[PDB]
Paper text:
RIPK2 mediates inflammatory signaling by the bacteria‐sensing receptors NOD1 and NOD2. Here, we reveal that RIPK2 kinase activity is dispensable for NOD2 inflammatory signaling and show that RIPK2 inhibitors function instead by antagonizing XIAP‐binding and XIAP‐mediated ubiquitination of RIPK2. Here, we reveal that RIPK2 kinase activity is dispensable for NOD2 inflammatory signaling, show that RIPK2 inhibitors function instead by antagonizing XIAP‐binding and XIAP‐mediated ubiquitination of RIPK2, and identify structural features of RIPK2 required for XIAP binding and for the design of efficient small molecule inhibitors of NOD1/2‐RIPK2‐dependent signaling.
To further understand the structural contributions of R1‐R3, we crystallized RIPK2 in complex with CSLP18, containing a hydrogen (H) in the R1 position compared to fluorine (F) and methoxy (OMe) in CSLP37 and 43, respectively. CSLP18 forms two hydrogen bonds to the backbone of the hinge segment residues Glu96 and Met98, and the R3 sulfonamide forms a hydrogen bond to Asn151. The R3 hydrogen bond helps position the phenyl ring and R2 OMe group, which inserts into a sub‐pocket formed by the side chains of Glu66 and Leu70 of the αC‐helix. However, the R1 position does not optimally fill the hydrophobic pocket (termed deep pocket) formed by the side chains of Ala45, Lys47, Ile93, and gatekeeper Thr95 located on the β3 and β5 strands of the β sheet bundle. This is further revealed by the molecular docking of CSLP37 (R1 = F) and CSLP43 (R1 = OMe), which demonstrates that the larger R1 groups of these molecules more optimally fill the deep pocket (and EV2F). The RIPK2‐CSLP18 complex structure revealed the inhibitor occupying the ATP pocket of RIPK2 with the R1‐R3 groups of the inhibitor inserted into the deep pocket behind the adenine‐binding site.
Author numbering:
A (entry chain A): 5 to 49, 53 to 167, 188 to 200, 207 to 315
B (entry chain B): 5 to 50, 55 to 165, 188 to 316
Write the structure that this text describes.
């Protein structure tokens, strides 16, 4: 009964555009609003076909209808004959991929921060699932997860390399789908390692996973230093099971994770974040 | 063209309710969601149809003003047994507590105070630049909640200090004015740079109303506002122009944001987190 219309931001109110990152889904730039006096990110894509506009609008309204504390907050759409793009909050620290694999800038990443990030990811995906109707991500990657000033998760890219996160039952030309990806991410988050490093052709990855093989679980990929190691390992291995029905919903995962995050003090999170900024500063 | 329906949260999905604080605008409790697995705050009642209509008005105003510094509403609980607004849980409470709880919060680094002022101005300016412009007309340190990282979140669109004189007799038809809000902001800025109660010496609020209608404002001196305050002169000019006897002399929030940006720009990004962690540590162990 209570509807809210996504504001249409005029293009000429967006100053200081700068290419932030290009990718398959389009190009993302940074800008600042003339009236709101705040920084924002803009995702855009020749003239515009009607299908392209329809897909961009689908994505924008999906962001608008799934507003949650850990879902990328959309601010408005810029829809003009000259330009068309989605406006959202600017996430300075970029994607989780950079955080994980930029060991020069990010030498250490305290376990409290890693687990808080995992928890917020699960929370975002679970809220998307608990919508009506249930909203399916169908494409979770360490590149979709953006991190704000305090390294809090913000998920993006919900609507219609990238093979690491695909369940085996999709090779043959669902809710469980998403959890699979999540499991993988957890692995890639506790190890800071590329899944299937030794494999050079992605079809090798597809073959190994279709044979029921997953990334290595050993002493090197996951050190014993990792907190709550055994629970995380059980969660991961059951979360990427060959059979979809055996994979748990995100609510079971949240119930399993909450006591894990509960062992970290509130201040240790900020300590890890500020230590990360300091190691990156020096 | 893009509509978004506020989810209707069932009452039975709110577990572990606890009276957090009662007040004029109603009572706010804390609770936890069964499916979303997150903590939330719930504003509830003490029901006529007029009350329900007003609650729906508040809910739709919060939902239509979704902004980074506006209290994020999650859903509405509309059942015959209960009716309430559900929003994000702001653990550290309101700005008033931060300012005047010197036991838990002995020191408050200037970077964080300026971040809070900046975010307040940003939220109010966003409210003004809407279509149509939405007026707060009741800004106080109790409306400003503080999230996990002490980021400002405005809500709710001895409490007269933040009301301009032309609003005491509410000329609603005549002077439901834009400048009103800026007045409030000025006062808060003072109370944020001094950590002191405006009109401390006055004990009767009607005396405060008379004095303010007489063109009197809080004192600006060496004690209320020490010279230690960063950018002291610029902030003092902002305050004095924000509570001018004449409403038209008070600037829009866009002018204030344009003046504040260069001030916030002088603090490095890490100093904010350092001040916040210092606040969290001083509040602990006490
Ligand atoms: C294909 C669309 C990307 S996305 O799939 O992740 N989604 C999506 C994302 C964003 C967004 C992105 C970023 C960002 C900034 C810097 C960097 N790095 C440093 C500079 N060089 C490259 C690496 C990485 C990411 C910040 N803030 C945002 N708000 C904005 C809108 C979006 O709309 C779906
Ligand atoms: C009480 C003012 C109402 S309000 O004017 O600020 N508006 C409004 C606010 C809220 C809200 C409030 C709180 C909150 C938490 C701790 C405390 N303290 C601790 C115990 N001692 C007293 C002080 C006070 C408030 C947290 N999170 C929320 N989300 C929820 C809905 C609202 O309705 C729009």
């Amino acid at each position: 009964a209570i509807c809210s219309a996504l504001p249409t931001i005029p293009y000429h109110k967006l100053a200081d555009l700068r290419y932030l990152s290009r990718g398959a889904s389009g190009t993302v730039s940074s800008a600042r609003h003339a009236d709101w006096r705040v920084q924002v990110a803009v995702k855009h894509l020749t003239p515009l076909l009607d299908s392209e506009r329809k897909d961009v609008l689908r994505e924008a309204e999906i962001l608008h209808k799934a507003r949650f504390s850990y879902i990328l907050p959309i601010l408005g759409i810029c829809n003009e004959p000259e330009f068309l793009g989605i406006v959202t909050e600017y996430m300075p620290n970029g994607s989780l991929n950079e955080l994980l694999h930029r060991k020069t800038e990010y030498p250490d990443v305290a376990w409290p921060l890693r687990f808080r990030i995992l928890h917020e990811i699960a929370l975002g995906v679970n809220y998307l699932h608990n919508m009506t109707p249930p909203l399916l991500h169908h494409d979770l990657k360490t590149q979709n997860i953006l991190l704000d000033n305090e390294f809090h998760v913000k998920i993006a890219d919900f609507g219609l390399g990238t093979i690491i996160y695909m369940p085996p039952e999709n090779y043959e030309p669902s809710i469980k789908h998403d959890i699979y990806s999540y499991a993988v991410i957890t692995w890639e988050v506790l190890s800071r390692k590329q899944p299937f490093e030794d494999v050079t052709n992605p079809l090798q990855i597809m073959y190994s996973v279709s044979q029921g093989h997953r990334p290595v679980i050993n002493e090197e990929s996951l050190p014993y230093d990792i907190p709550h190691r055994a629970r995380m390992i059980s969660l991961i291995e059951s979360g990427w099971a060959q059979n979809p029905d055996e994979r748990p919903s995100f609510l079971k995962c949240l119930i399993e994770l909450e006591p894990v995050l509960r062992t970290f003090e509130e201040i240790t999170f900020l300590e890890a974040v500020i230590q990360l900024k300091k190691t990156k500063l020096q």
